[PDB]
Structure formats: C-alpha cells, structure tokens
RNA sequence: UUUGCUCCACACAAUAUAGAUGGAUACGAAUAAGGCGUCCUUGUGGCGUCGCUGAACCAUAGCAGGCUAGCAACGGUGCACUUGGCGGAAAGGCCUUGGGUGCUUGCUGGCGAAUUGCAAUGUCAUUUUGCGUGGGGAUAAAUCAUUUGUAUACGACUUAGA
RNA sequence: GCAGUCAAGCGUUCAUAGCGACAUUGCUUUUUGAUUCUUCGAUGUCGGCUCUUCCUAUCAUACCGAAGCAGAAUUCGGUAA
RNA sequence: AGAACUGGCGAUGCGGGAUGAACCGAACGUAGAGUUAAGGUGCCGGAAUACACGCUCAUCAGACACCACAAAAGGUGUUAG
RNA sequence: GGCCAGCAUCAGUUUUGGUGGCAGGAUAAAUCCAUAGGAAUGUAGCUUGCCUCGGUAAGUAUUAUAGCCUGUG
C-alpha cells in the first residue's frame, strides 16, 4: 500500500448517559498516512467488537517512531493471509533497521512469493528477537555468523553514454 | 566464390574469336589485339597476373574451347568454357595452365574405359505444350466439353489463387539437366580405322 | 612445479570496509560499513565527512580497497575515533582514484582564460617532448 | 534462499601439481597429464597450500551449489586418474554364439571389432579413444580391459562397446547376449 | 558524435543491439556493424533453432517466391531484428536504413577504424550469470549459412595482422611515455598539473 | 549524321544534397577476470601498477586567420616529388627512404583590422551534368533486313554471310 | 466422436501387461440438433470424374521404449504427416 | 430467446483498448498557452533500456480489464509456509 | 509610416530553479553527553591441548591492551 509509518490509534464507542466513559482500545497500525490508518483501525475493531465508526470515535492518533533507527534488528513477523483457495497463518523473519522498514519488505515478500495483495494480509505481530538462537529461519541465521564477509562478484557499472570505447570489466 | 583475374593465351584461334562476336563477317575482328600485345613487354604484366593467381586463389579453372571445325557441323563459332583443374598445389595448377596455352588436350588425358561419368546438357525443345503431355496428366473423358487434355480442377476455392504446384500449359524441353552415372564403353581415337 | 591457482581477490563487504557513496545528498563521500543487514543492504557511517549513520543499498555505494579495524555495529563516536586512528582519509587521498577525482573537479572549474593557458602550456610541452622523441 | 557461501576441499597428493587460470584446470602427475575446461560454471578456485585447494560459490542457488560438488568430483577424478589411473573390465556374454573380439586398424585406427554377435554376419566396430588402451585379459575367459588416465574416456569407450551390442527384436530378458561392464577400478594395485 | 559509428557486434544481444541501432539511424547517425557472426541471443541454441524453424515454415502458399523471405546469414538475421524496429515502408524509414551497414567479419575500411561497443546491449553486462545463450554464427550455419568457415579463416588472418599493429603501437607509446617523463617535473608540466592536466 | 571518344588539368555555367562545420582516435581474449610496466626459470611464472567510464586522447591562439623581422631548436607538420615494402574479405589503402618547398603559437618584435554601424547561417562543404579551349591516349560494334533449324505461337533462341 | 482422473473389479495368482464399474474432468467441430447474424433486385444441390494443397486423432514404411515378448506372430506406447 | 432498474449505442465525433456501434476516459463553435483523464514511456512511437524487494528458465515460457478460453488430476523442478 | 525583427521596462496566463523566516509532533525519534545495569557473533588477561620459537584452537573470563545492548536523565 506504500511507504509505511506506524501509528498508535485509539478509539472508543461513543459515550452514552448510562455508560459515559466507554472502555478505550488501541491498535498499532502500519499505514502510509493517518487516513488509511484510522480506516484500518475501524476495520479491525469491527472484527473484534460490537462497534463501527458511526457509533465510535477516534480518541487519538500518533505516529510511533523507531527507538533505535540505526541499530540492526532481527524481526520475528507473524501474518494471517488469504490465498486463492483458503486462508493461512505464517511466521517470517526479517532483518532490518526499523519495524517500519521491516513491514515494507514483508508486504513485498508476501506479494512476490504468495501473490498476496495488501487487502489479503493481517499483520498479527512484529517483535524484535532479542537473543540470536531464538532466530529460527536460516535465511537470516546465515547473516549472524562471526566475522562475516562476502564479496560481490560480477560487478556491472551503469553506462552513461550509449557507446563505449573500452569493453567493460566486471572486476571488483 | 569470386573471380579476381583471367590470364589469356597470346594467340587465339579464329574459332574462339568468333564466339566473341555476333557479326563476324562485318566486324574488324579486333578482339584481344591489345591483350596480345601484353606479351611483347618481356611478359611483365602477364607474369604478375599469373603471380597474382598463385598468391591468392582457392581454385583454378582453365579456359578451353572446342575445335568445332574438326566436326561435321556447319556452325564455325566454337564453344568456350571453364573446366576446374584438380591435381596439384594451386601453384602447380597455374604452371600447368601457362604451360598449356595454345596447346591442345585429349579425352584420354581425362577419361578412361569403364569410368562412370555425368553429362550436363540442354534437353531437346518442344515449344508450347499443353498439360497432358508436359505433366503426365490424365486425359479427361471423351464426353467433356471445352476440350480434354486439361486439368479439371485447377485449385480449391481457397486459397483464392491458382497455386504454384498445379500443372499448367507451357514450354516443354530446352531444359538444363545434369544426368549422372553413364559408364564409358569406349574411348575411341580419331586416327584409328 | 608448485600448484599455482589464480586467486581472484574481491573487495569484501565487511565491518570496517570503506565505501565511496555514489548517489544522494552524500555522494562522493566516504563511509564505513558498520554492520551488515542482508546480501543487498548494509549499515554505513561516515562522521568525518558528515554522512549520517544509515541503512543503505550496496548498490548505491562502490566498495573501495580500503579497510580499517572496526567493531561490528560500533556507534558513530567510535567510528569517528577509529577512522581517525587508521587515518583512512590521507590513505584515500593518496589513491589514484581519489587523485583522478580531484583532477576532473579541477578541470571542470577552469576559467575560459585558464583553458587558454592550458593550451599554450601544452604547445610548450609538446615542443620539447616531440624533440626528445627523436633523439632516442 | 541464496547461500552466502558454500565451499569444497580438493586434496592434492605428493606426485601432483594442479594449475588453474581462468577456469582451465591442468593436472599433471606420474601417469601423464589431463586438462579440463570448467569455464561453463562460475566458481572460485583458491590455493590454500601445495596439498589443498578450495572451490567456492558466493551467493548461490540450489542448482548452482549443486554444481560445486560435481566440480570437486570432476577435478578429484582428474587427480586420481593421473596417480592411480582407471581400469574398466567388461565380459563377453552369450548363450550360444561365441562373440569374437579383436583390435583392428585402418589408417592409424585402433578399432574394437566385434564379430559373430548372436550369429550376426554383420561386423560391429567401435573406435578406441585416445588415451585409452586395450588388453584382452589373459587367464580370464571372454574379458576385455580398457584403461587410461581419464575416467571419462575409459568409461565412455567401455559404454560404446556395450551399446554396440544391444539386441533387437528379441526378449532381451532371455536374449542376454552382449558385452557388459563387470568391474570398475584403478590401474595401480594394492590401491 | 562522430560521422559514422562502427559497432563490434561480438558479445552483444541481438534485439538490444537492434533497438539502439534503429534509434540512432532514425536520429540521423550512420551506423555500421561488424562481426555479426559473434552476436548473441539469450536462450539455449536449441530454443533459438526451434524458433528459427517456426519462421522457416511461413511462406505464401500460392507462391513461396512472394512469401516471407528467410535470410540465413548472421548479418541479415540481424538486419531483420532491426528492420522490424523501423517504419520501413516510409521514406523516412528507407532513409534511416540506407544509413546502416552490417557485416560478418570486419572487411576493409573497417578493420583499421576503431570499433565501439554498446554496454546496454552487452551480454556480459546484461545476462544473469548462468543463463544459457546462443551465438549467431552457430545458429546460422545450422539453418543454411554457407560461410562460417571462410569468415573464421579470414578473421584469424586479420587478427594476426592486427596483433602486429597493436604490438608496434604499444612499443611506440612506451617510448612516448619515456619522453613524457623527462618532461615530468619540468616547469611547464608542474604548471599543467596545477590546471588539472 | 558535319569533329566524335577517353584519361589528366582550369574555365565559365548550371544542377543538386535524408543534412561537414576541430579528429570514425584499428590488438586479441577473458568477465567467478583482465590491461599495462618490469624481472625472469619464458610460465596456467614472480613483482609492481591501473580501472570505479571518452568528464579521455589528440588537436585548438593569428584578416575564416592579413603583411612583415628576429632568436632558439634540427623538432613538428602541409604539399608535390622520389626509394624500398606491405595489404585481395569489398585489397584501391597502409608503411618506409631521400632531397625540395611552405607553415610553425617553442620564444621575442614591427604593421594591419573601425563605417558589416547593438543580432540577422551572413555564404568558406560535396553531388551529377553541360559547353567550349589544349597535355596525353585510343581508332568499335550492336541492331533491321537476309540466312540456319540443335529454336520458335509472336517476340525470343541458335547459325551463317566482304 | 475422441481423450483423461479415482481404482472397486477383470485378468489362474496379481487393481493399472492389456483392460476397467460407480463416479468425475475435458477436448473435437467430417454427426445431429439448437439458434437465425449474413445472403431471397440470387453466392446454381447430391454423387462421381480430374487436380492441388493442408491437418493428424498414424493404416503401411524408418528408429525406438512395454508385454501375461521363448521363437514366429501380435498387442500397448514414444519421435514421426 | 424472454423480463427488472439504471446507464449507453441507435442519433456521436474526440483520447485509450493495435483492430472493433455498445467497454475505459471524455461528449464537440474558430484558435493560442498551460495542465490532465483513461492508457502508456526498449525500438516501431511522443514518454525513465528509471528506482526497489522477490519470483520464474519452459526441446511448443510469459506478457494486462470487457477479450478473443482451458479442467480434473500429477511433478524428488524451484520457492516460501 | 508599410513589412519583419532585436532589446528594455511592464501587464495577463503559466512553467522551472535558488534562497529567508516561522509552526507542529514523544515540544519528532536518533547521534552526542552523563549514569545505572547487562549480555555475547566474548575485547584484554588467564588456563590447558597440540604446535618451526607465536600462531592457532576450547575453555574460562563481562572492560581490562576493542566494543555493543537496555533503561533513566
Ligand atoms: Mg584485377
Ligand atoms: Mg500434342
Ligand atoms: Mg503417364
Ligand atoms: Mg515421358
Ligand atoms: Mg457434352
Ligand atoms: Mg486431369
Ligand atoms: Mg521389443
Ligand atoms: Mg518376436
Ligand atoms: Mg509442414
Ligand atoms: Mg535527399
Ligand atoms: Mg595484473
Ligand atoms: Mg606484459
Ligand atoms: Mg605474471
Ligand atoms: Mg584514451
Ligand atoms: Mg598561421
Ligand atoms: Mg605577432
Ligand atoms: Mg566496404
Ligand atoms: Mg576536346
Ligand atoms: Mg464424426
Ligand atoms: Mg471405487
Ligand atoms: Mg500383476
Ligand atoms: Mg483380484
Ligand atoms: Mg441460416
Ligand atoms: Mg437468397
Ligand atoms: Mg443479391
Ligand atoms: Mg450469379
Ligand atoms: Mg461463384
Ligand atoms: Mg502425434
Ligand atoms: Mg521411443
Ligand atoms: Mg505375470
Ligand atoms: Mg508431405
Ligand atoms: Mg505440420
Ligand atoms: Mg433507425
Ligand atoms: Mg459517445
Ligand atoms: Mg513496426
Ligand atoms: Mg521515444
Ligand atoms: Mg479479472
Ligand atoms: Mg486487444
Ligand atoms: Mg510446487
Ligand atoms: Mg514583425
Ligand atoms: Mg510577466
Ligand atoms: Mg524553506
Ligand atoms: Mg576491535
């Protein structure tokens, strides 16, 4: 759906005389803007509670920024999604530098591997994996080995003119 | 394959010269009279063409003609042609060639008894031929109107064009053919009762 | 008769490898690979050249032959201290690469007069060289 | 998922020196020398010492990595083939018609000439490949022996012979006639 | 940029080479292309052989002489990829095409003229490592081209003369560098360094 | 058939132009590898260096480039000659010798430029042809008609005729 | 009309050598219907004759893999028009 | 073949869907400048051989609504779960 | 003043750059500084077993002869 911000969203059903001060519920929501974010909120509250937007109210909406945006983190990611013929729960692991970055590559991944558009996905949880070795998926374990190094073979430089007088070299 | 030069004998019989003309009797017969002069200058420009053939050349063919006058025919004008030389090195070939200018060559130097040879010739002529005899098509029945040495159906409705592959009236004979495997039964000699 | 097997000696993505940033607000600026995210993405940092600690695509960067000792995931202050320590800047500056960059930056700043001075000076140079090139 | 690197080891023994530029492998040893063109694959050969060479793949897939080991094998079989060498034994097999097998020559040839197969008036011919030599095993009945520095040419020359004697228009379960490969080994004994 | 650009087809991918060559002509740049026999097409040899036979069966049922023509030579397989990228039944299109020349090998003029390459169509720059591909000359011989051997022979001959040429030149620029260095450190040279030269 | 043809030269007239405006500036081969330098045990060799684009290299100052003097070099280059050699893939071009001659912005001098009026492509290339002039050079054929029949509906073909 | 999937059965024994029920997925457009778009100020039926070309769901011919292929004979299958 | 509500075509050009009565965009006086729709931007052809993460290798790959078709079933190809 | 242009200063419409001052939010979040605590893809030191004179490895070891994480300010 885009480049994500993450939002705390807080709502409640409207007050009534016999029930002033209804309970107040919160969701974290990944969206490109607060309009999609409040929308998503109402979308999930209605899967959980007797409410809808006409009888509820948004109390607060705030963007949550990453605590340590230049610290590499190992994310565990938990998703529900629909396929062409059923619906399915999934656990993935994503290594990045923010929840927000991490969720972008998730949708990308879900679109690429499983052909799941944004409508078909529910993020259930995004959590930082504190101890390496609770890291489960090998496509990440791979990047945790000590003194890790790797070359980038077959370098291909972008030409800026249509003709060239050399004959390139993919050295690196 | 491309030709890069032709080197010619210094003297040419009127028999060939005639081939180079369409009206001999009226003509000044100037054919090769400047070429012939090239021999004068010690040989200089003839050697270097010869030289040039050797330096290059993937193949060498020799230019010969028939002695049609030694023949009972009426047609004076001889036949001239390229025959590929096949023994030795390229250089040995042109050496052979130069050596044989104005000189003469005999079938026995090229064929022998019991050899299988081929014959390349233009087929007899028959002019405009209808479809039956030209293609071996079946005579239509006797009752048919508009004639019967024909093809009844010249094509289906589609393609809406007559096709290249159906038989049609037109020329018969005077074709090129390359006929092969004719054993030689005799190589005769003219000077031999 | 020893074995003799080629080599092939690629620059490695690795903590402490300096990279020259090719496009962005930074650009033309050096930086150090701090931590390593996946095959395509690393965390870089370039305090001495004022380039912000950030995640970046390898593809936006071109690896340099320079490396210096850096602890994986070392923060900016540490990065600035170790960098200065290994004096990577003068090391870079000494490289033909760096020098070739400075060259064409200078060429591009030439005044039209200066251009005319260069020409006069190359005529001058061509004279004595084309001379030398005829006496040996 | 792309493995960032997997590698393999290639032991080198006292007799031999192996030498690799681009991906052209040369292995020299006591029994002669073999070379083989590995350009069609993309792997990085590293010398660690005079008795050890690594081959590796960086950022490779299943099929790529799958080719790492077979590269190791191929160069292994070049090394041993140059030290021990290879020997393939085959047996003639027939139920009635004795299969007659000699070596013949026409214009610097060396052909394996198989005669009388299942009675066949036809004369089967297989060429000897270069680098493979052929002995008709003394002291063993209806046994041919193909040996040489290259598992590839020895094994293929053997396979050519066993394939020149396939049966046709017969229940090949009953008609078991042929020349079959019966043992695969080395030339130099104890090993 | 130059009156005539000579492209060393070797190692280029047919339709990417074609795409740029066509544009250039349309824009008025004369192009001549050499060593089309060393062109590539992605896809293994068999694939492109099958494709070529598909092409081969299209013909005018009533007269195959009017029907699509099948040229077998690498230069002309190439022209075909090109011609179909040019509004070639218009004056403007004929004009663009007259601006084009294609060769197997490098025949005279062009063997002593520089040739360039076109990186956005360079196979070694474009094709992912491991993906099979075809060489034009080998595809062409298999569908009838008669002259791979002859081209190969001439090319090896040409390649020897050019190795001489190169050698002489490299010998000469070695001298020239020896000269340029006595002059190094001189006053006029330090001044030029000062100005980026 | 009223002095024609051809190559070289200059001259006037035309006609044009798919588009000059400093230079198309020559290894090959590999790309999970190479170029160049250098040494050597001449090799799948040692050692050094480079790339990260031609943003280069070469050329480039002078009435669109005038008239002139000198110095230092002995270099560069234009032109017409001349010596030896190479190149057939479409060679039709490359290389080399030697004298001559011009220019030289390598440096230092004398003179000239305006009024084209504050810009007007401001005209500097290369196509094909036509006509006279004079330096070489060269002095045919084909067609109709006639004729043959190895050919033919007619044309065409194939023969023959000082 | 032609071809599959499942596999209870057939096949002395043995589901699948060769076959295949109950079910069930298709393909074809030389069957026959269903429709009524075009042609009723005309696009002259059926068959045959002649002649070309094309398709393949291959009857024969080349080379093969199966078999309840001992041999001979045959059957099933592939590349094949 | 036959009804319901709306919107269209018929009576209507224009931009897109290559082509096309009905789909998408948008409804028309004669013109300048600007900006867009739907749809595009390797070349044909105006417009990034743009950026970014994956997936896919097909000896009949695949490639954009209406729309110019494919199913049960099956794969120790590869991917993620 | 007929024909067509160039430039300047403006006016209507528009396009495309440079640059100044401010407001908000976790009164951004980070970096940085201070401080407390901690761990391992464990820095120094130490132990032990090989091992061409110190290089490895497998232990111990939480800042030492690198550093990082987390909270709070
Ligand atoms: Mg000639
Ligand atoms: Mg008759
Ligand atoms: Mg008959
Ligand atoms: Mg007959
Ligand atoms: Mg009648
Ligand atoms: Mg008939
Ligand atoms: Mg059988
Ligand atoms: Mg039988
Ligand atoms: Mg066909
Ligand atoms: Mg024109
Ligand atoms: Mg090197
Ligand atoms: Mg060298
Ligand atoms: Mg070396
Ligand atoms: Mg250069
Ligand atoms: Mg001058
Ligand atoms: Mg002066
Ligand atoms: Mg040419
Ligand atoms: Mg005259
Ligand atoms: Mg039927
Ligand atoms: Mg059942
Ligand atoms: Mg059974
Ligand atoms: Mg049973
Ligand atoms: Mg009807
Ligand atoms: Mg009607
Ligand atoms: Mg009618
Ligand atoms: Mg009628
Ligand atoms: Mg009709
Ligand atoms: Mg079939
Ligand atoms: Mg088969
Ligand atoms: Mg049985
Ligand atoms: Mg047929
Ligand atoms: Mg067919
Ligand atoms: Mg009406
Ligand atoms: Mg409308
Ligand atoms: Mg087109
Ligand atoms: Mg365009
Ligand atoms: Mg749909
Ligand atoms: Mg369409
Ligand atoms: Mg699968
Ligand atoms: Mg005006
Ligand atoms: Mg204004
Ligand atoms: Mg501002
Ligand atoms: Mg450290």
Curated annotation (Swiss-Prot), chain A:
Glycyl lysine isopeptide (Lys-Gly) (interchain with G-Cter in ubiquitin) cross-link, renumbered residues: 125, 131, 149
Chief subcellular location: cytoplasm
Example GO biological process: cytoplasmic translation
Cell compartments where the protein resides: Cytoplasm
Pfam families given in the database record: Ribosomal_L18A
Tagged with keyword Signal: no
GO molecular function, one term: structural constituent of ribosome
Keywords carried by this UniProt record: Cytoplasm, Isopeptide bond, Phosphoprotein, Ribonucleoprotein, Ribosomal protein, Ubl conjugation
Family: Belongs to the eukaryotic ribosomal protein eL20 family.
Role noted for this protein: Component of the ribosome, a large ribonucleoprotein complex responsible for the synthesis of proteins in the cell. The small ribosomal subunit (SSU) binds messenger RNAs (mRNAs) and translates the encoded message by selecting cognate aminoacyl-transfer RNA (tRNA) molecules. The large subunit (LSU) contains the ribosomal catalytic site termed the peptidyl transferase center (PTC), which catalyzes the formation of peptide bonds, thereby polymerizing the amino acids delivered by tRNAs into a polypeptide chain.
Protein name: Large ribosomal subunit protein eL20A
Organism of derivation: Saccharomyces cerevisiae (strain ATCC 204508 / S288c) (Baker's yeast)
Taxonomic lineage from the root: Eukaryota, Fungi, Dikarya, Ascomycota, Saccharomycotina
From Swiss-Prot, chain B:
Molecular-function annotations in GO: RNA binding; structural constituent of ribosome
Outcome, altering residue 145 to A: Cells accumulate 35S and 23S pre-rRNA precursors. Cells display defects in translation elongation resulting in decreased translational accuracy
Deletion phenotype: A mutant confers resistance to trichodermin, a trichotecene toxin produced by plant-pathogenic fungi.
Entry's Gene Ontology BP terms: cytoplasmic translation; maintenance of translational fidelity; ribosomal large subunit assembly; rRNA processing; translation; translational elongation
Protein modification: Methylation at His-145 by HPM1 is required for proper 60S subunit assembly and promotes translational elongation fidelity.
Keywords: Cytoplasm, Isopeptide bond, Methylation, Phosphoprotein, Ribonucleoprotein, Ribosomal protein, Ubl conjugation
Placement of covalent cross-link Glycyl lysine isopeptide (Lys-Gly) (interchain with G-Cter in ubiquitin): 38
PTM-bearing positions, type Pros-methylhistidine: 145
GO cellular component entries: cytoplasm; cytosol; cytosolic large ribosomal subunit
Domain of life: Eukaryota
Modified positions (Phosphothreonine) in chain numbering: 5
UniProt modified residues of type Phosphoserine: 58
Location(s) in or outside the cell: Cytoplasm
Additional record remark: Present with 450 molecules/cell in log phase SD medium.
Family to which the UniProt record says this protein belongs: Belongs to the universal ribosomal protein uL3 family.
Protein name (record): Large ribosomal subunit protein uL3
Gene: RPL3
Full-protein interval shown: 99 to 291 of 387
UniProtKB/Swiss-Prot annotation, chain C:
GO cellular component labels: cytosol; cytosolic large ribosomal subunit; nucleolus
Principal location class: cytoplasm
Superkingdom, taxonomy of origin: Eukaryota
Protein keywords: Acetylation, Cytoplasm, Ribonucleoprotein, Ribosomal protein
GO molecular function terms listed in the Swiss-Prot or TrEMBL record: RNA binding; structural constituent of ribosome
CDD domains per UniProt: eL14 (cd23702)
Localization per record: Cytoplasm
Gene Ontology biological-process annotations: cytoplasmic translation; macroautophagy; maturation of LSU-rRNA; ribosomal large subunit assembly; ribosomal large subunit biogenesis
Family annotation (InterPro entries): KOW (IPR005824), Rib_uL2_dom2 (IPR014722), Ribosomal_eL14 (IPR039660), Ribosomal_eL14_dom (IPR002784), Translation_prot_SH3-like_sf (IPR008991)
Annotated Pfam families: KOW, Ribosomal_L14e
Keyword Ribonucleoprotein set for record: yes
PTM section of the record: N-terminally acetylated by acetyltransferase NatA.
Its job: Component of the ribosome, a large ribonucleoprotein complex responsible for the synthesis of proteins in the cell. The small ribosomal subunit (SSU) binds messenger RNAs (mRNAs) and translates the encoded message by selecting cognate aminoacyl-transfer RNA (tRNA) molecules. The large subunit (LSU) contains the ribosomal catalytic site termed the peptidyl transferase center (PTC), which catalyzes the formation of peptide bonds, thereby polymerizing the amino acids delivered by tRNAs into a polypeptide chain.
Miscellaneous comment: Present with 45300 molecules/cell in log phase SD medium. There are 2 genes for eL14 in yeast.
Family the UniProt entry places it in: Belongs to the eukaryotic ribosomal protein eL14 family.
Protein name: Large ribosomal subunit protein eL14A
From Swiss-Prot, chain D:
Source taxon at top rank: Eukaryota
UniProt-listed PROSITE patterns: RIBOSOMAL_L6_2 (PS00700)
Record-level GO BP terms: cytoplasmic translation
Broad class of the protein's primary localization: cytoplasm
Alphabetized UniProt keyword annotations: Cytoplasm, Ribonucleoprotein, Ribosomal protein
One Gene Ontology CC term in the entry: cytosolic large ribosomal subunit
Gene3D superfamilies named in the record: Ribosomal protein L6, alpha-beta domain
Pfam families xrefs: Ribosomal_L6
GO molecular function ontology, one term from the record: structural constituent of ribosome
Keyword Ribosomal protein on entry: yes
Location(s) in or outside the cell: Cytoplasm
Additional record remark: Present with 52400 molecules/cell in log phase SD medium.
Role: Component of the ribosome, a large ribonucleoprotein complex responsible for the synthesis of proteins in the cell. The small ribosomal subunit (SSU) binds messenger RNAs (mRNAs) and translates the encoded message by selecting cognate aminoacyl-transfer RNA (tRNA) molecules. The large subunit (LSU) contains the ribosomal catalytic site termed the peptidyl transferase center (PTC), which catalyzes the formation of peptide bonds, thereby polymerizing the amino acids delivered by tRNAs into a polypeptide chain.
The family this protein is said to belong to: Belongs to the universal ribosomal protein uL6 family.
Record-given protein name: Large ribosomal subunit protein uL6A
């Amino acid at each position: 759906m885009a480049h994500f911000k993450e939002y705390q969203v807080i709502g409640r059903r409207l007050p009534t005389e016999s029930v002033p001060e209804p309970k107040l519920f919160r969701m974290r929501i990944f969206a490109s803007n607060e309009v999609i974010a409040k929308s998503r909120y109402w979308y999930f509250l209605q899967k959980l509670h007797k409410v809808k937007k006409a009888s509820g109210e948004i109390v607060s909406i705030n963007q949550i920024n990453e605590a340590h945006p230049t610290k590499v983190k190992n994310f565990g990611v938990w998703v529900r999604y629909d396929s062409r013929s059923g619906t399915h729960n999934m656990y993935k692991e994503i290594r990045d530098v923010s929840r927000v970055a991490a969720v972008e590559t998730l949708y990308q991944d879900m679109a690429a591997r499983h052909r799941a558009r944004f409508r078909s996905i529910h993020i259930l949880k995004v959590a930082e994996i504190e101890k390496t070795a609770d890291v489960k998926r090998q496509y990440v374990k791979q990047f945790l080995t000590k003194d890790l190094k790797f070359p980038l073979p077959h370098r291909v430089q972008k030409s800026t003119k249509t003709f060239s007088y050399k004959r390139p070299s993919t050295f690196y | 394959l491309r030709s890069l030069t032709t080197v010619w004998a210094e003297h040419l019989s009127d028999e060939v010269k005639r081939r180079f003309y369409k009206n001999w009797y009226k003509s000044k017969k100037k054919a090769f009279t400047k070429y012939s002069a090239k021999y004068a200058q010690d040989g200089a420009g003839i050697e270097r063409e010869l030289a040039r053939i050797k330096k290059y050349a993937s193949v060498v063919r020799v230019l010969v003609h028939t002695q049609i006058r030694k023949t009972p025919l009426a047609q004076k004008k001889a036949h001239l042609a390229e025959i590929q030389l096949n023994g030795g090195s390229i250089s040995e070939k042109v050496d052979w060639a130069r050596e044989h200018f104005e000189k003469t060559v005999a079938v026995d130097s090229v064929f022998e008894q019991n050899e299988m040879i081929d014959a390349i010739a233009v087929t007899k002529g028959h002019g405009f031929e209808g479809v039956t005899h030209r293609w071996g098509t079946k005579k239509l029945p006797r009752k048919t109107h508009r004639g019967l040495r024909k093809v009844a159906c010249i094509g289906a409705w589609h393609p809406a064009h007559v096709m290249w592959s159906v038989a049609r009236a037109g020329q018969r004979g005077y074709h090129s053919r390359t006929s092969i495997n004719h054993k030689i039964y005799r190589v005769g000699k003219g000077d031999d009762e | 008769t020893d074995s003799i097997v080629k080599a092939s000696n690629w620059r490695l993505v690795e903590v402490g490898r300096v990279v020259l940033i090719k496009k962005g607000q930074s650009a033309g600026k050096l930086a150090a690979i701090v931590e390593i995210i996946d095959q395509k993405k690393v965390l870089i940092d370039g305090p001495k050249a004022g380039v912000p600690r950030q995640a970046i695509n390898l593809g936006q960067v071109v690896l340099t032959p320079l490396t210096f000792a850096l602890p994986r995931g070392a923060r900016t202050a540490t990065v600035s201290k170790k960098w200065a320590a290994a004096a990577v800047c003068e090391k870079w500056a000494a490289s033909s690469w760096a020098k070739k960059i400075a060259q064409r930056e200078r060429r591009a700043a030439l005044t039209d007069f200066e251009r005319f001075q260069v020409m006069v000076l190359r005529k001058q140079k061509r004279y004595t060289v084309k001379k030398a090139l005829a006496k040996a | 998922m792309k493995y960032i690197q997997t590698e393999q080891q290639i032991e080198v023994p006292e007799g031999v020196t192996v030498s690799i530029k681009s991906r052209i492998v040369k292995v020299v040893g006591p029994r002669g020398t073999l070379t083989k063109n590995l350009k069609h694959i993309d792997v990085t050969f590293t010398k660690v010492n005079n008795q050890l060479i690594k081959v590796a793949v960086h950022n490779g897939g299943r099929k790529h990595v799958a080719a790492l080991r077979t590269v190791k094998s191929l160069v292994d079989n070049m090394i041993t083939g140059v030290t021990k060498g290879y020997k393939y034994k085959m047996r003639y097999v027939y139920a009635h018609f004795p299969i007659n097998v000699n070596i013949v020559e026409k214009d610097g040839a060396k052909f394996i000439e198989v005669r009388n197969f299942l009675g066949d008036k036809k004369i089967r011919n297989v060429p000897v490949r270069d680098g493979v030599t052929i002995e008709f095993s003394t002291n063993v009945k209806d046994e041919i022996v193909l040996s040489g520095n290259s598992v590839e040419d020895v094994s293929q020359n053997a396979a050519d012979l066993q394939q020149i004697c396939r049966v046709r228009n017969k229940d090949i379960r009953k008609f078991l006639d042929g020349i079959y490969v019966s043992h695969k080994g080395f030339i130099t004994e104890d090993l | 940029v130059e009156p005539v650009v000579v492209i060393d087809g070797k190692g280029h991918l047919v339709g990417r080479l074609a795409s740029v060559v066509a544009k250039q002509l349309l824009n008025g740049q004369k192009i001549v292309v050499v060593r089309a026999e060393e062109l590539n097409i992605s896809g293994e040899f068999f694939r492109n052989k099958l494709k070529y036979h598909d092409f081969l069966r299209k013909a005018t049922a009533f007269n195959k002489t009017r029907g699509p023509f099948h040229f077998r030579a690498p230069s002309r397989i190439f022209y075909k990829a090109l011609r179909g990228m040019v509004s070639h039944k218009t004056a403007r299109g004929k004009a663009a095409l007259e601006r084009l020349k294609v060769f197997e090998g490098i025949p005279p003029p062009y063997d002593k003229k520089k040739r360039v390459v076109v990186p956005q169509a360079l196979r070694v720059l474009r094709l992912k490592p491991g993906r099979k591909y075809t060489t034009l000359g080998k595809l062409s011989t298999s569908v009838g081209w008669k002259y791979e051997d002859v081209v190969a022979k001439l090319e090896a001959k040409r390649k020897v003369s050019s190795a001489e040429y190169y050698a002489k030149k490299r010998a000469f620029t070695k001298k020239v560098a020896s000269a340029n260095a006595t002059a190094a450190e001189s006053d006029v040279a330090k001044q030029l360094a000062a100005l980026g030269y």
